[model samples]
Target chain A: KRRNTIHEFKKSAKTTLIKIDPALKIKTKKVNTADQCANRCTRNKGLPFTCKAFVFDKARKQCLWFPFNSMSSGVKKEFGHEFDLYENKDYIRNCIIGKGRSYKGTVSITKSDIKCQPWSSMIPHEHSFLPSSYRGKDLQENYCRNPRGEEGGPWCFTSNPEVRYEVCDIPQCSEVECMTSNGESYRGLMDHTESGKICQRWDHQTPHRHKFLPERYPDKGFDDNYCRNPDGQPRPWCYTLDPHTRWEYCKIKTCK
Target chain B: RRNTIHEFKKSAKTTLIKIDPALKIKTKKVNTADQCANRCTRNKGLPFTCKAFVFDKARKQCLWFPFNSMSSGVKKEFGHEFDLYENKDYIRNCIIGKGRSYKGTVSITKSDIKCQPWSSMIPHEHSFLPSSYRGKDLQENYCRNPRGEEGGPWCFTSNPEVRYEVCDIPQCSEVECMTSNGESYRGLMDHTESGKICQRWDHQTPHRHKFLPERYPDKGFDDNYCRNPDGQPRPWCYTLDPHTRWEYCKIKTCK
Candidate 1:
């Protein structure tokens, strides 16, 4: 008789504990200038993060380190000498756009749970971790209007009450059927690619179901001009233009 | 009293030896990055006289730190990530110029010696010692032309080539006469302020000495002027010129 062997499987999870180094005594050293502190931070091996701002305590002779993200106009004015701006071109550009002469709003992180995470902790998730909000009152009548008239008229997105769409009623659905239902009529709104002409709308509900056949000609044999059901039968195509027709009622049962 | 003083000397020397061991260890740790190993043999606690350059093994980067004195081309090339340029206005303008098209370079160094021996070292006479020790300073002094117009023109002496005419030819005694290029004639070779015109060549070199009796009257002295003993005009008066003259000789003096 063959020897019987018992096999067992166990589910397991592992937690990695990052050993924290001894807390360094944040002692302040009297620096003759802010540039000296910045240079020190730049060259310091132990510092994991780049020194974005420096706070000088003259009496204590200690320079306090702060993150670059913490920089504000008030902070800049107070301890401008303690820290040197890293001079990131992209960050500087964002700053300019955020605080331009014509721009009249606060460009702040708008999304939920916006925190300054270290590079090692930054991981991709389903939602963006850093959603920014640019909020401000548009006092100018022609705010956001094309000053150069390149867009044909002063198309101020902020000022134009007529063009403003209802924020709450905006559609939220996928592309394939959304275009055929609602946005197919619009000229430029439709995206034509190598696959086919896809009707892609800007900020609207996407269509979930597509009709297989015309409602008037349900008995017609499998036609490419109309949609087909899962059972290889033709379905009705109710015109959405008709006010009496309910979109939910015109749904067809198909594989797609 | 002499015997007591001798014993005190011996005791003091013994204490120095005990403290000397700790000093040597500290010196070794401090001087690890320096070319000179022994701090006492060298100047102890003195600002490093030699030019410091950083070699980062981790990043495979070599940086000539404090890049303010570098040329513009060198700054543009090596200065990626860091804006070595001093002018914040220029940096801001460049960032905003043309749809935010800009480039800047930053220098990275090893973390170990980032801010050793205090953040900023004070400047001292022996700070130029390393170059002096290597004998490069002497060579640099010899080849360096103070009058040469190349490599950012600078004048070491008042006027390196001031053409002074021999006042008494046989005696070989000469008066410190101002040449056309001299500061006395051109109202200083380099302009301290921006919109100032250079003196005309005729007006620069003094034709006659002011100590002796005047050879020409005020009207005749219009073309050629002479400097007084105080290195100023006999009658301290400056002639004004047209607007075009000021614009022509405006040379930017670099520090």
Candidate 2:
């Protein structure tokens, strides 16, 4: 299988129409080649939804775009003679490594809930940073990015008048795993309890209520749905979404 | 449109014992280390990668750099008046594969559904027990592939109807050809220079190299793929022939 690996000419893999979602169909356009369809899908050209999969009709020279893929739920294979399907690799293998300079996720809001200003726009705030200079960084649609390899992951200028910029709340793609023994310093995004019940948001005191707010326990990493231990416990525990079960310890491993 | 910003207290462990002057560093007048940290976090007007900051206790000055002592080529030395603090976000804490080594806390499924804890099997049941798979890291609702499934890391879905699903965790695509060290090259080039067939990482008979799969599981040590596992200038691999221990691959350098 490893022999003749150099001249494998298939740039992106293709297949017959494995699945299609009529609700996810954005539009059908006539294109000269299947490569053109790949370009349009990659650039997300005016497509409201994040284009995950596209079908190129070789016979009719028509391109069909969809937001779902074979991996998506309710998707199944269908017979197609002249169609070639290509799914967006960027969306499917969606985790951030290193500084996330190639992060192309749709996270467009700052950690403070401020909308990001477009890279091409200079209305709210402007400087030398531009999409033209930083190619392949996907500097478009006000999506959070780290064009200059900033230390704080992906960030962007905020739409807020006074607030200049803030880090976007993007989850670092998960890696295999251990947590601090006590997990007092565990800032991971594991929001589920040991029993599989979803953890209640720290900011929201809905199903069960307690005073573990970020303001009360500063530096406890009360961000998003990540598990944390504000008060002293053996390990990290969170209030569960289940009204009956007030709280439970996350079954995270102790870092050896 | 400015409202009072909500700020959180950072850890005191941010400070380090030393700073290296050899790195590209910038200086600014600051009273406290906390003030310098504030500027570093906000990250405005600073024209550098801003990985870490150094506070001069005696001189009351702040120094910053695009990289820290942990970065390659930089060495730390004891400075009587210096205290170094690095940006935690800059650290490479994420993973790149089936997350066989991913200890991160992402407990949600690919569809944003919560993960069912490994202990309890209310909606669904599976044989992946914590006691059985001790090193498999079956804790909490984390998405894991203890059996090393081709589907990468996955967890039991909280949604009762759906038994389990793959997590939305993304692969850190180090897809760049322009890197000087070729550390970022995740391309599909499988042959070495001089048309030599690269040896599979799992194979150790011909040229017993240290680039083993179990040691560096996250580095994609699959199939005879040429990799710079030991921080080589370019992507290289041990060849099948016993004569040549290893050779750099014929990877194209971006202009």
Candidate 3:
């Protein structure tokens, strides 16, 4: 039921992934089919708030429209056979849209490996940066925040007494390169080698074992099972899934 | 001069494979890349925004465009002969004075620690829950400035010993065109008046000159910031164009 083709919306089946918040819901209506419900989201006008996501209940034939997506606050995935969810791609913040003021991702580390001091605390460090000072900023716990609009991007006070503060290692959301010039900065999602063999994850030590661990090389971008070249190779390469082949270069273009 | 010679940021040695059809580009036959840069920077003759330009060394051709590869639909490709340069204003990769709305995905802190996820209640946890800060998109372990704080984006740490730290985001390069006489201009302009790329003073292949770094130690003849090595006139440099050995740079006097 979720496999329907809808422009600009990603569909998922058997899921009602959102909080039951009153402000989040835009409108609800009884519809004949899921397609009709999708039309209400896609073609409707005069709504006060923007429509971000919608859920279709097949058993009851009801449509629930909301301003928030699965990624929104208080939204969590729940299993339901009768329900189908459609989320607007524009509403999804997987990648940064503009300056990333609305960036709701889950990367909490600093560039220098210094733990971000809690905004609400003044134990090891004495400061006035608090959650009350920055409402809606999500300055919760020890998360990295840029509530002050500093030019160096997201930063926070240091828990370490010697150092005061530092900037985080956040990346700009842009078009990913298919092939890297030197593979040093390649962070794409290609997981296969030149001969089409699946690449091994740096975190996993199975089928093959090596010294290139994710913990050892934190800045090398060893994300998932994606192919990478942490050793300054000519191009992006990875440890192969094949037991015979220890490693191989990926078949990415040279950007030329 | 009509306007002051402002410094521009340089891109990697790549050229555009396809130009956006909507934009109108200008072409000229030039001997060197710096000549192309000068013409583009000066905004000579052509109207629209002169954002970027490409120079073909083999063909000795200069292609000027109002849009660059970074522009929405435009695309760029790697080429040895084709060198691309853009205005610093157009390159929006880095942060401004203080990025109030900085939503970049840098999770590491100033002390190089991995950020704790917003939803995680591990080594430390408090009121900054994702549900509380509704629109802030406090999804994962990223740095954010939800409160518009002066210190940019910061995050909590997984380290129980340490509470939190700031991220190491870099700011854009800073300031101005030139001084009155263009004597103490430490900007990054590397083009001659006739639109030719300045030849490196260290090299002796094309137009060998007496102006070596050994001769002029203190004079700023480094990586082609227009310099007044000889006591002739304003700041000038030896052109990459063998035909045109030297020319004055059009650096404006400060107000």
Candidate 4:
């Protein structure tokens, strides 16, 4: 038979003892401001990192030392002029605009007893170059000019009264003009022409018509023969000939 | 400069003289019993509803004394027990199923201590009898017959065959009779004239030709009239209808 035994452990006898070495030594120094405290930390043999700024508690007469890189912009702004300092590395990264813009700092504390002078006045200031107003006309002309010295094309040439225009082939009108009994030309409706002829004729011998016509018909002109018909009614000339003229009495052409 | 220096001194004096309000001191008389302790109700200006028991470090005991009460006269009833605030032998372990019943007097002996764990003692009257039928003690008017044979206000006839007594009761085409001994005797087919006779012939004495006069008809009958065209008494088909309308009718086979 197996013997089953249960034992009761008395809770009253349970005790915890901790042994501390009283002989162990630690050194402490007091400073008036956080900057002095930070300097002390930097000078200490055990601390390798440099201290930049410190926080002071007037009632407690204690200063919390901090690295210049460790303090956030918000913390520095909040502490303001009250903080005492020895030397602080400018937090340039915090003031930067783009990449790698972040705070990196450590916080420490010290008693306020070690004598130290206040830091010299060092106000932060910044300057930037900006013109009050830009000259609009000059800028527009500069941007519009071709960089490769290419002359302005037809789109830029101004032919007043009869604004300069580019002619495209009117293939369907070719056969009509070639087969017509009267000499005919296929210039745009804006061209001057000879009376009794289908074609526009340019002659310096006669006085010219008004340059651009009325603003309502700024680009209007007509074939000389189309001006009047047997019934004394005006016949409309072709505006575009991709499709032949189909209005009554208007000549229709077939193009190969 | 002279005016500013005078103002500064005045402000300094004002700051030095500033004082915080004093906090009032409170004293209480706590009673002890074993390892428990609590404030006594008899003490002046004690709280009015403190019945909580606590451990008293000075007396080294546990005590339960009301620190507050509604009436001063009610406090007098405590008598000498009220003044006797200490009890050394009282243990913190409460007796199982027992607790304090009243105030004032203390229990002198274990037997004198009377208490009971509060419980619901009322008996439940069930609408129906308990499912477990047998027990050491049985209740009256509770053991009812499952057959429901008694005819009364609470009794009803639930037997299925009882409905047959009605004049217009519908008749069943087949009735299966099983004996209490577990033997089955198949009665006559419904179409037969003999209403409830066994299907087999025990002793043959021919009366009607249509009726089977043979035992275990698989064995040929002795009667000549029962012979088929083959000239041998038809053993299997002897009792079948002559038109063979019922030839397909066979006994159900056992699996």
Candidate 5:
């Protein structure tokens, strides 16, 4: 939603992730309270750079600022927590609108479980994992889903790295009206192809109910591998190291 | 004489215009480009080596570079104007072919020969002619890992004739590497990889040190001659393998 409508429609927002610490920190200052720490990042006097984010400590009343390079100031963000971290409001709003939405190039869609594998377990060659600023566990499965922090949209891993894996601005399941409508589904917002001026957005509420569509093909015959979504599969995109591909989405039903 | 050591022929009667006008290391006015080429052939002194040599046309000056700064996965470049002859006998000498290298048709960048060390001194069947060295795993535009170092990453390339650069191979932990205990392993700053600059194996080429990144580009690959397109043939020219084409051999074309 539009948080603020200024002269040019600026969104006034502060996206704060409670109980999280920064993977990397640029500066720290002691303050009186958590809200004052928020003001510390918002208004600056001696700092050399602009503060896009702040992770406030409740007990110590300390304010931590995020720099442009430390964790990718404008677009991407990383958080750590066993306790609380209060981020500034204005910078958080940038995540949903303007240039921030392209941050969809992510690996996991599950916001419920944010824990990652420990660094020791990631020592293998084909772990398909990324070096974390931090991790808390180990990994299993032949190919883990592009490891949590790496770049890519809500994708499932399939050993095959050649398939143009990207977050195509296609719609998610629930947005389209289902013929049955026994439940609800979800689709992604519209994606405008650069040249076509092609914009497509279908917002959906989660607990997304989806079904596997057919395989997709790339015009040229498949000599390598492709993605498939078999029925009753836990992961939506099952991998096929065979000779056919032109995969489609799963046919999910919506509940009323 | 510098002529008695490493040598290669000058290019097809052309000049090698030095790519950078900066760092004029050493210069000499020669009766011809051949005299200029001889001085930079450096078959003697220790540590440093010459990879690419330059010829100034308007000034008739010989410029020798012990180092070509712009590379990690590609080749060094001097413009088409001067005699920019690389050591074709060892084509790897001309460009910094890392995990990736150029074929006559394609170039692979995300790769390393992870290349085993080869020497002109060794009587291996070598082909410096660009195309005679057919790159494997070919497709539409180019191929991946043309020189195909046994263990390394895949790379990209479309212009084989392009100046190839140097790059690092995947680490032992990254690839299925075969190395002795302490002899082969990466060293992190601490028990966990929480530090920026760590340490590891030292680069000792000639094990000529030319064709690999066992060490980083800046600190390794000492004293190996590669293709200098504008210079003359080292004694190690492709005389043993006459079947190789003229363009492939170190045949001098300039005065």
Candidate 6:
């Protein structure tokens, strides 16, 4: 059952809960997005578990909401990494910003009561919204409200639970580059990580599934038995696993 | 100066000195004594050198070693029908004016074995250093296998001092083995005197049966060829080691 959101407390994006306050969790639920997760808990009232805060994992599509009694000053709200979390203003107040201190440049904070409904209805908003996120590839200029120095404005970060972010002017720009070390490059992700960049090359396979053609016939290439060499020993053989070791000779005379 | 000690007797026996098995590097079968010495000379590495070796005449085996190349390296030895030979580089002038003295170098060593053959038959041990054959000319005497042979004819220093002479003996014919079980075989069926079948594929054919296969296609001397690919007991492989002789390849056998 959906309920009303506390609306004043900050919504920390990319920020996730480090420790679970076991006592407050009623039961876990599967949700579609972090927004839906928070709404599911915030609207939860008059129930055995009144949701106060939650952590959401987009990759896993999971939401873990906690109640009031489960938290205290003793529990730390560290960086938001793999997942993100949100808490009600009644319980989260200024906890999102600096959690306590402001060590950097000029900073701003604002106190206001929030009464939000389904953003379904479009309205010209004179009231601005600030969103804070810790992880993402896009350039983040997130502000409490606006870099315009508006005290009561929203920021792109929930004080940015995960800090030291980068405006990486790094090359590759997220595009993949191919080319393997013969017996190299395989199936994997292609992102900021090395493995990603080397997922699979015209010359690569998934290691074991790779071209076991020793000496040097490359992937999609051939070895001695491949019959490709047309010659003999030290000849080229295909990864065909075909018995045409002799037939292999008749087809493509060289590596295809 | 030349001494008469190098003179060899046809009746003298092959000899041996005791050594630790820890020193053994390898062993192979051979028919003639010259083959053993040649194997030693051509052996390039592993032991870094094949300085000395013991040849089992009855067994037709050449046990090669690399240390204590001196005749006096060990105190006592016990083996019948086995003769030991030292590398020429290791066997020069003995340490004194007492036992024996020599003038020439072991340079012509292999050919030295060509001429001086210490007999395979046991000689009267008492006949070696006994009676003062003080005369410049001496008949027959005992010495080590100057070449690679088990036992060879050696000269004597009955006068107490000696210039090791390797005497020439008519080449002995290959000794063939006919088993009691009647596994009748021609010259050297690769067996020991003890009714044992030796499985050295590279084993030398007796001089008689050596009417023979050419030692080529794969010469035994080159560290390039392989022996015992079927892995019996210890099959050896000539490794890619540039400075090594044949070493156990531990090759896997196919079913």
True contacts kept of each: 0.00, 0.00, 0.00, 0.00, 0.00, 0.00
Considering every candidate listed, which one attains the maximal lDDT?
Answer: 3
- Which scores better on TM-score, 2 or 4? 2
- Alpha-carbon deviation at A238 in model 6, angstroms: 65
Interface RMSD of each: 17.8, 24.8, 17.4, 30.5, 16.1, 38.5
The TM-scores, one per candidate, come to: 0.15, 0.26, 0.27, 0.12, 0.19, 0.18
Please provide, for model 3 over B1-255, each residue's C-alpha lDDT reduced to its tens digit, 9 standing for 90 to 100: 322113344433467644336668889998866677677766334665566788777788988887765554365544667777665544544443455445455777889889888888888775779777754546578776566577767788878877777777765333335666667775555667665777766556477877786667667566456786566457888876778888887655656
Q: For model 2, how does the per-residue alpha-carbon lDDT over B81-175 read when each residue is reduced to its tens digit?
A: 67666553333244344556454467898898899999877778888888788556577787777887777778898899999998876653333
Off by over 4 Å in 4: A1-29, A33-35, A41-49, A68-87, A90-256, B1-255
lDDT of 6 at B34: 53
Could you tell me the lDDT of residue B155 within candidate 3?
80
* Global fold similarity of model 3 (TM-score): 0.27
In model 1, the Cα lDDT at residue A9 comes to 7
Off by over 4 Å in 5: A1-256, B1-24, B45-48, B68-81, B89-255
Ranking by TM-score: 3, 2, 5, 6, 1, 4
Docking category of candidate 6: incorrect
Best to worst by lDDT, what's the order? Answer: 3, 2, 6, 5, 1, 4
When candidate 4 is compared with the true two-chain complex, its DockQ is 0.00
Q: By summed lDDT, which 10 consecutive residues of candidate 2 chain A come out lowest?
A: A1-10
Report chain B TM per candidate: 0.15, 0.39, 0.38, 0.14, 0.29, 0.30
Per-candidate RMSD, Å: 32.9, 27.5, 26.8, 52.5, 26.3, 31.3
TM-score of candidate 5 relative to the true fold = 0.19
lDDT of 1: 0.23
Off by over 4 Å in 6: A1-9, A20-26, A68-71, A94-256, B1-255
Q: Which window of 10 residues has the lowest lDDT sum in candidate 3 chain B?
A: B1-10
Query: Model 3 off-target regions past 4 Å?
Result: A1-195, A200-238, A248-256, B1-6, B15-21, B42-49, B57-60, B68-81, B88-255
